[PDB]
Design a binder for this molecule. Sequence first.
Ligand SMILES: OC[C@H]1O[C@H](O[C@H]2[C@H](O)[C@@H](O)[C@@H](O)O[C@@H]2CO)[C@H](O)[C@@H](O)[C@@H]1O
Ligand SMILES: OC[C@H]1O[C@H](O[C@H]2[C@H](O)[C@@H](O)[C@@H](O)O[C@@H]2CO)[C@H](O)[C@@H](O)[C@@H]1O
Ligand SMILES: OC[C@H]1O[C@H](O[C@H]2[C@H](O)[C@@H](O)[C@@H](O)O[C@@H]2CO)[C@H](O)[C@@H](O)[C@@H]1O
Ligand SMILES: [Ca+2]
Ligand SMILES: [Ca+2]
Length: 686
Amino acid sequence: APDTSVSNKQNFSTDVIYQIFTDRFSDGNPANNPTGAAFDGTCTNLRLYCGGDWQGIINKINDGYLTGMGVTAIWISQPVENIYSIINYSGVNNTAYHGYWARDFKKTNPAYGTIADFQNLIAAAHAKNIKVIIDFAPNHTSPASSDQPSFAENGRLYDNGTLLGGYTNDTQNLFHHNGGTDFSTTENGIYKNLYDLADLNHNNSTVDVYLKDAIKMWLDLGIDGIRMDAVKHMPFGWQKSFMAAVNNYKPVFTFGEWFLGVNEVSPENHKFANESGMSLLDFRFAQKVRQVFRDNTDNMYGLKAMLEGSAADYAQVDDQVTFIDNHDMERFHASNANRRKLEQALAFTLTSRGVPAIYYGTEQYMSGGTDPDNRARIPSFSTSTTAYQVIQKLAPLRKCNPAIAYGSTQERWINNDVLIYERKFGSNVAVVAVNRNLNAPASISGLVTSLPQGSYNDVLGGLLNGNTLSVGSGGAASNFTLAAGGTAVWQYTAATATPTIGHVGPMMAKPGVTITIDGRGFGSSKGTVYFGTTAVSGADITSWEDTQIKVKIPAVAGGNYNIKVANAAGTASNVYDNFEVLSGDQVSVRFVVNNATTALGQNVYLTGSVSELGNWDPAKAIGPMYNQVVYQYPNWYYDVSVPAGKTIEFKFLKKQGSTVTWEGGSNHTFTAPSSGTATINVNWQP
Ligand SMILES: OC[C@H]1O[C@H](O[C@H]2[C@H](O)[C@@H](O)[C@@H](O)O[C@@H]2CO)[C@H](O)[C@@H](O)[C@@H]1O
Ligand SMILES: OC[C@H]1O[C@H](O[C@H]2[C@H](O)[C@@H](O)[C@@H](O)O[C@@H]2CO)[C@H](O)[C@@H](O)[C@@H]1O
Ligand SMILES: OC[C@H]1O[C@H](O[C@H]2[C@H](O)[C@@H](O)[C@@H](O)O[C@@H]2CO)[C@H](O)[C@@H](O)[C@@H]1O
Ligand SMILES: [Ca+2]
Ligand SMILES: [Ca+2]
């Protein structure tokens, strides 16, 4: 199947995701609606259930609403069984309408539907070429109070109906009992509860195994991706061992939520997207887009800088999920604002690098503040708004113009208010012009592009006041005026003759798993795939077409590899880097080192004999280790994904900048569990 097929669960770059709060979309089955105090059919009270469900979604897929818009993926609320209690929070009643308060990860939330409703949803969507993504929130269960076990459901956790345990009398230690976070440090927001949510202890084997099993069921149900909640609040090593369980079983595209504030740029965020096995919601992009197009607190120069920086900070920039708003921000559209701002931010997002996501109702110009105000019910299913038409014209280009799905981004003209950028991939080009100045036109002279000589009509047809472009030889465009609030998209598509890889997925897996290599120019005859210097050809290449190749990872040593392909004639493609071959299946193990005293600005790291521990390379050592919460300095700890059942030799080190101090003595040693978790406690050797 081609790269753009609904069947590609490994690549969402050619899709347009539509984000839905199931409860607030469409109630197609009134019979599963909660009753009494939990329910408000008028949806005036935004904290109760309004009744939207899977049937409703199914209906909107079949009556042409989503498909007419060009949407090709839907992202829905966590589908698992939620607590049934109404929670009064100081006078205000709250329900689990959001799906974020899990009680059993093996069953469905009956307000959304039954397992059968779930399967029908997957079927309908699939039939209309729409992929299905689900929220998955394994960080916690529900609101709990340790000494008031009668509060809510005491954070109770069931395994398909069977009680595993609760927050009060947690002898099994299913949960963390370290207090609540102040979001002060990263370590602090990981090992303590968020608010009053009962925090799962992933270092407990039962929880570990339970969650890895629960996700397999959903995979088995046909899901196409997973959106992980609170990824900055769970151990990084555990999360990696979870991605491995997914990828070594049934790989799907996974992206998590790691919130970034205005002007916030975090190296821990980049390292996580670069190394964990999953990608992230692009908050850096969204916050910037809002400053520029909404709040006017930055200009084009700041947008451009975000585009260049990000392309450099993220190893796979094309996998970061972009948006202009979501359930955690006030709606982009402010009641009294010019609609053009939203139209422009949308056009920008759709033609930009990454995987775009549209929060439901955006195309209807919904306004609203923070939670729960940004979660009202979609007021209408009209296809006549300008925003709806913007999406409708632009979304499809991601499927038909690879420059949009996979190209580089390049600024070709800029000032405070105007940005002209070009996307390029193979013999494919897209040039987009944006003038945020809603009051003044701009004189554009000196624009140089890669488009071939000719005239080009605005892809939006003048919808946002775009114009035609005339490019002469050299790619130089002739002078033109870019209207106030103007937005124009111009493009050129052609066959790519040489193999060009545009995307690889999953990005991490053990030998033997099949990965998907997407791009153009691969030809229709099997060629060769190189993992590093190792050549793979023949039968292990399970499928080969011009835009997509499926091949099993060879049994090479764990480590990081570059991928390159060569057509049947031997022409090789560009190198796609950062592909991680696992040493085997993974388990999450906690390493604890006692009495490793350090100087300021000096931290302890861990290294060892397997690629998962960096193979003795201090530049690739794991850390810095933690030393506040679970163990206190001069004791350090850390949860690490390691190959299961392997005997591993390791050592700790102290780094300062790139200056390294090794532990003395001989290597510590240990044998990883075959499943479940473990804790290895040792003392630092001088
Ligand atoms: O002409 C090549 C040139 O085009 C763009 O420069 C623009 C500039 O962004 C505008 O602010 C204005 O000064 O006109 C210039 C073109 O004459 C590109 O930004 C630039 O990199 C490139 O050299
Ligand atoms: O919170 C981690 C913190 O630990 C390390 O600093 C040690 C310091 O080296 C000791 O001399 C001592 O005073 O305790 C500190 C930990 O509280 C790193 O130096 C530091 O960068 C790191 O954040
Ligand atoms: O280079 C691989 C090598 O790294 C580690 O050796 C350390 C050693 O433990 C230190 O005491 C120190 O002198 O630096 C060496 C780095 O070369 C591993 O301990 C060793 O097994 C491994 O082969
Ligand atoms: Ca319903
Ligand atoms: Ca946590």
